[PDB]
Write a protein that binds this ligand. Structure first.
Ligand SMILES: O=c1cc(-c2ccc(O)c(O)c2)oc2c(O)c(O)ccc12
Length: 105
């Protein structure tokens, strides 16, 4: 399962999806973007590079704990932004990729 989790990350990082996945590669840079309310709204920030480091450090007991951090990442985007924001559309497109792969394991 955890080997299947590494492949899920490889797909989400792949060039085919980079046009909408790139905001989720790294932690939201609140200081550079002026998002000084982000920490008040988002209790648990999460991104793909942090997920990758947690995976390699064996911080996930199983694929469901891995999947929870991926979905936390999307849920943070859906919570913080207005629904018509372009970043929300990008999160949904990347969630499409993740959910189709996660379903196959
Ligand atoms: O949910 C997000 C929201 C935003 C964002 C940026 C500038 C604004 O003026 C704004 O209203 C929202 O930026 C992000 C980002 O840069 C990421 O890498 C990942 C997620 C987000």
């Amino acid at each position: 399962q955890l080997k299947c989790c590494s492949g899920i990350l490889k797909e989400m990082f792949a060039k085919k999806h980079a046009a909408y996945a790139w905001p989720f590669y790294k932690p939201v840079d609140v200081e550079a973007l002026g998002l000084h309310d982000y920490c008040d709204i988002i209790k648990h920030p999460m991104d793909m590079s942090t997920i990758k480091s947690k995976l390699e450090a064996r911080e996930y007991r199983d694929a469901q704990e891995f999947g929870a951090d991926v979905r936390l990442m999307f849920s943070n985007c859906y919570k913080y932004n207005p629904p018509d924001h372009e970043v929300v559309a990008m999160a949904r497109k990347l969630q499409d990729v993740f959910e189709m792969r996660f379903a196959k394991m």
